Amino acid sequence: ATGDERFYAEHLMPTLQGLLDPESAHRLAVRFTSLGLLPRARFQDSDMLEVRVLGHKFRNPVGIAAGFDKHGEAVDGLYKMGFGFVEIGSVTPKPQEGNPRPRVFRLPEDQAVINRYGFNSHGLSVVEHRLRARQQKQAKLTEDGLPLGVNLGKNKTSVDAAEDYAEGVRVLGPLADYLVVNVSSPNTAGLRSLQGKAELRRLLTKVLQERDGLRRVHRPAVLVKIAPDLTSQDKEDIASVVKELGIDGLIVTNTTVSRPAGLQGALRSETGGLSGKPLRDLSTQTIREMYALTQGRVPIIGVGGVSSGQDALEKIRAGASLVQLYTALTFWGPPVVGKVKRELEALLKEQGFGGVTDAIGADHRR
Ligand SMILES: Cc1cc2nc3c(=O)[nH]c(=O)nc-3n(C[C@H](O)[C@H](O)[C@H](O)COP(=O)(O)O)c2cc1C
Ligand SMILES: CONC(=O)c1c(C)c(-c2ccc(-c3ccccc3F)cc2)nc2ccc(F)cc12
Ligand SMILES: O=C(O)c1cc(=O)[nH]c(=O)[nH]1
């Protein structure tokens, strides 16, 4: 491990947490990242980390999950941090404030966070203009193996969920390499019920029709992001719909509304989605199930509790083509990205894999 990794983990990040509430810290992180005020990414991506999936080259398989850069303010800084791809959002059609504060809670003893942001968003128009300002810069980044995802949400007061997602496809689809239909936020009432079979098919048909209506060069992949709290029936229904409609991929998983036995944090009973270490294995197991139900034919982006190369490789071996992290960055700071990549490269070599591609779904072939 580097000196930076230890300095961030043992001194800088604990000091920031002592000085700032979690939402203030989040806001400062976005500001610093937006300005490129980052420690040196002391890691060069090797060819063994390259993945080709979703119609794109990814220089490395480690992305920033949705919810860090909600409004597309820090995209270039996130690539500078060493992420192989960036997902912004969730973005709602109209601007909205989200839930009242406080709405983000640290669980230090669990290496977890609980959030109930409630889709605070600058809205599609603001985000569209922000992405248009750097659109050719992004085109060059994507061509150089650094794609951009856009995660779409719905407004609190909307009468027609499918129309909210459709508006997102029309507005931000032309600016994205992939879109995410986030039907798994625990913090918008009735949103997770869009994961049921009848509603999901109707919703996703409309989304895919809208996407197919974009000009070929501006046509993104469409992924569905799912909760970790689904029944077996829900998961078997989602897999069925994904295959029937030709959805391009799955993001597995969002935060959990469960509170696993063993949580120690004083704030464990706060309402919201739980992220970080306690979500890790529930998530890995969800990837495993979704990979099996889709016969390994549907790319999965694996997310939930990744904070080491081992965590990344477990999700890859379970079926993920790519991984994302968020909560790990909030505890360990920017050096965690290089750490995960360096550890993943070493473990791939140790386990006899030529690269990331060879490891995808390897547990299912044992
Ligand atoms: C503060 C916070 C805000 C989030 N906001 C979003 C969001 O707007 N849209 C979304 O799809 N996921 C959101 N997530 C979920 C993450 O993208 C990710 O699925 C989850 O946190 C699991 O990854 P992790 O354990 O590495 O954090 C958020 C997570 C946190 C902790
Ligand atoms: C568990 O306690 N953790 C937080 O309260 C927290 C932190 C410290 C951070 C953070 C701050 C700073 C950098 C950074 C430091 C140097 C250069 C660039 C950076 F982005 C990174 C991340 N971001 C968050 C985002 C969401 C959230 F819910 C909580 C946090
Ligand atoms: O905005 C939020 O509250 C939020 C959205 C989401 O999809 N996941 C999450 O944990 N929080």
339 C-alpha vs ligand 2 centroid, how far in Å? 17
- How many domains are there within the chain? 1
Shortest CA distance to 185 belongs to which of 256, 106, 100?
256
The annotation places the binding site at: 66-70, 90, 115-119, 151, 182-187, 225, 253-255, 276, 305, 326-327
Number of the ligand 1 atom closest to the C-alpha atom of 182: 11
Shortest CA distance to 168 belongs to which of 108, 231, 124, 130?
124
DSSP 12-38: IHHHHHHHS-HHHHHHHHHHHHHTT--
- Judged by its nearest atom, the ligand closest to the C-alpha of residue 7 is 2
Number of H helices, E strands in the chain: 14, 13
| Cβ of residue 119 lying under 6 Å from some atom of ligand 3 | yes
Residue to substitute in 115, 283, 325 for testing ligand 3 pocket (most ligand atoms within 8 angstroms of CB): 115
Q: State how far the Cα of 83 lies from the Cα of 89, in Å rounded to an integer.
A: 16
Which of 185, 283, 308, 321 is flagged as catalytic? 185
Q: Longest C-alpha distance within the chain, in Å?
A: 53
67 C-alpha vs ligand 3 centroid, how far in Å? 7
Q: Which domain holds residue 265?
A: 3-364
- Judged by its nearest atom, the ligand closest to the C-alpha of residue 4 is 2
Is 125 marked active-site?
A: no
Pocket of ligand 1 (CB under 6 A): 65-67, 70, 89-90, 104, 113, 115, 117, 151, 182, 225, 254-255, 275-276, 279, 303-306, 325-328
173 C-alpha vs ligand 2 centroid, how far in Å? 29
Structure determined via: X-ray
Number of the ligand 3 atom closest to the C-alpha atom of 187: 3
Residue 197 vs residues 26, 158, 210, 257: alpha-carbon distances, Å: 35, 21, 20, 21
Assign 81 to helix, strand or coil.
Answer: coil
- Beta-carbon contacts of 21 under 8 Å, excluding residues fewer than 6 positions away, are 102, 104
Residue to substitute in 121, 281, 287, 326 for testing ligand 1 pocket (most ligand atoms within 8 angstroms of CB): 326
Q: State how far the Cα of 344 lies from the Cα of 363, in Å rounded to an integer.
A: 16
Residue with CA at minimum distance from ligand 3 atom 6 = 185
333 C-alpha vs ligand 2 centroid, how far in Å? 7
Residue with CA at minimum distance from ligand 1 atom 3 = 67
Backbone angles phi, psi at 53, to 5 degrees: -160, 160
Q: State how far the Cα of 5 lies from the Cα of 213, in Å rounded to an integer.
A: 46
Assign 58 to helix, strand or coil.
Answer: strand
Q: State how far the Cα of 355 lies from the Cα of 216, in Å rounded to an integer.
A: 31
Q: State how far the Cα of 217 lies from the Cα of 86, in Å rounded to an integer.
A: 20
Shortest CA distance to 300 belongs to which of 229, 355, 361, 341?
361
- Beta-carbon contacts of 145 under 8 Å, excluding residues fewer than 6 positions away, are 50, 56, 57, 58, 59, 84
Q: Are strands 85-91 and 273-276 parallel, antiparallel or unpaired?
A: unpaired
Experimental structure resolution, Å: 1.7
354 C-alpha vs ligand 2 centroid, how far in Å? 34
Residue to substitute in 107, 275, 284 for testing ligand 1 pocket (most ligand atoms within 8 angstroms of CB): 275
Shortest CA distance to 256 belongs to which of 276, 285, 242, 238?
276
Number of the ligand 2 atom closest to the C-alpha atom of 81: 18
255 C-alpha vs ligand 1 centroid, how far in Å? 6
What's the CATH number where 171 sits?
A: 3.20.20.70
